[PDB]
Ligand binder design. Structure first.
Ligand SMILES: C=C(C)[C@H]1CN[C@H](C(=O)O)[C@H]1CC(=O)O
Ligand SMILES: C=C(C)[C@H]1CN[C@H](C(=O)O)[C@H]1CC(=O)O
Ligand SMILES: [Cl-]
Ligand SMILES: [Cl-]
Ligand SMILES: [Cl-]
Ligand SMILES: [Cl-]
Ligand code: NA
Ligand code: NA
Lengths: 254, 254
């Protein structure tokens, strides 16, 4: 009866709450995605247990084409929903069922302020500034699969030297941008959150693609359509907008 | 199989081609949506027969909850697909199925350049400049249903005086903006198209909301998921972006 919700720590979507005593169960967590789940639970009338994905991955395929991460949890019916910044992509939609998007976004560039760099092609025609993405995430996959010239050049650079330009996670990418001469290809909603908090960083250029985050369900799940309708309701009522402004607003940067 | 596709004339989605002799069948039409249908038909391997919706409407409910337009064609299984700038909304998703969005947009304001107006709250707080939307479209319905104070205010104004501030169609709205002191609340992708072609008009403010256009199918159709997967493929390949640029780009503005 109670639904199992797979998710992953990622600021400001899902974070451990701060407290002076050990926390248990759903009380461990806060964030945009917990607020979304509370609003979805309200509308649809389910109870839920939040479970962190045991392997700490979003969802990609190994050499055998077996999935991992939140995507695999859904496939195997070890979770009923995945509520996280899980990008809606062609390869994932073949294997699980996403709701319609609760957030739309695109890949863009995180870099330091004050420089002459203005676009992905400024990066691509040069080698002094290093640049990369989180290994095996949807942004990397976009560069890997692209047949657009500029993105191909960029993939050749990223993948070169046993992928030394890639990072394991966004926090590693951020620190590399802050310390060295490095630009991170990152989803725009995460760039917005980061630039609101570190005033030496900025987004470079616009969005190079367009995509959404959606709630994952196993293929065939009856919850996919109920959740899509509830998301559309929350969007039209201004509630998704309110939730984004609650979690993104920073107060310290020009 | 040959699919039956319901659609509606709307620039630059679906337009009559120019020819010195009469045109027949699918050859009557061109535009972004025809290009999309060709790409979907190449991926999924169907033939198709394009039919203009007989009542010339997108789809809205009357007081008795009865539907019209392309939505009613799908509900009644008179068409297999609706391919048009058909906004994905809560009320429509309850009665038909949409693919994931092939375009993502929001309501914004079309107005003349060179004025002090910068946002919907600027319009809401006054009564001198008239403003409205296409009657019974998804933009009107957004305002009708909103409980956000600004938008309630705007709906009270739009709906006053026997809805004299509303218009029957987008071209009527565009002419009214060009001639009189009037602002049109319009989906942002159409404002883009218009302002590329009318250098005296501009978008005012940003997007008020976030929504998409999707291919519509009857509820339960097996094509909906196939078309979603095909749209995601076309997005990731950059084809949807190239299709938008092809149909939107104008001759330039001074
Ligand atoms: C935080 C990361 C690893 C996730 C979030 N959305 C993408 C995904 O769902 O693959 C990944 C980011 C990226 O690839 O830029
Ligand atoms: C062109 C119009 C009448 C359509 C297009 N999408 C909206 C729909 O699908 O309702 C309507 C526009 C709007 O309401 O601003
Ligand atoms: Cl857990
Ligand atoms: Cl698997
Ligand atoms: Cl026809
Ligand atoms: Cl969907
Ligand atoms: Na799917
Ligand atoms: Na539906």
């Amino acid at each position: 009866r109670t639904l199992i919700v797979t998710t992953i720590l990622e600021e400001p979507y899902v974070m451990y709450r701060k407290s002076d005593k050990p926390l248990y169960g759903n009380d461990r967590f806060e964030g945009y995605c917990l607020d979304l789940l509370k609003e979805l639970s309200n509308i649809l009338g389910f109870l839920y247990d939040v479970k962190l994905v045991p392997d700490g991955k979003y969802g990609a395929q190994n050499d055998k084409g077996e999935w991992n991460g939140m995507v695999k949890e859904l496939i195997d019916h070890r979770a009923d929903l995945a509520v996280a910044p899980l990008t809606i992509t062609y390869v994932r939609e073949k294997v699980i069922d996403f709701s319609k998007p609760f957030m739309t976004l695109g890949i863009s560039i995180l870099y330091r302020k004050g420089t002459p760099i203005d676009s992905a092609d400024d990066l691509a025609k040069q080698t002094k500034i290093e640049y990369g993405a989180v290994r095996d995430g949807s942004t990397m996959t976009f560069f890997k699969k692209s047949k657009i010239s500029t993105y191909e050049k960029m993939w050749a650079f990223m993948s070169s030297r046993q992928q030394s330009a890639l990072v394991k996670n966004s926090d590693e990418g951020i620190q590399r941008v802050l310390t060295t001469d490095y630009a991170l290809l990152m989803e725009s909603t995460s760039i917005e959150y980061v630039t609101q908090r570190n005033c030496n960083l900025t987004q470079i250029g616009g969005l190079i693609d367009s995509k959404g985050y959606g709630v994952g369900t196993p293929i065939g799940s009856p919850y996919r359509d109920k959740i899509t309708i509830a998301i559309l309701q929350l969007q039209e009522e201004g509630k998704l907008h309110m939730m984004k402004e609650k979690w993104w607003r920073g107060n310290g940067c020009p």
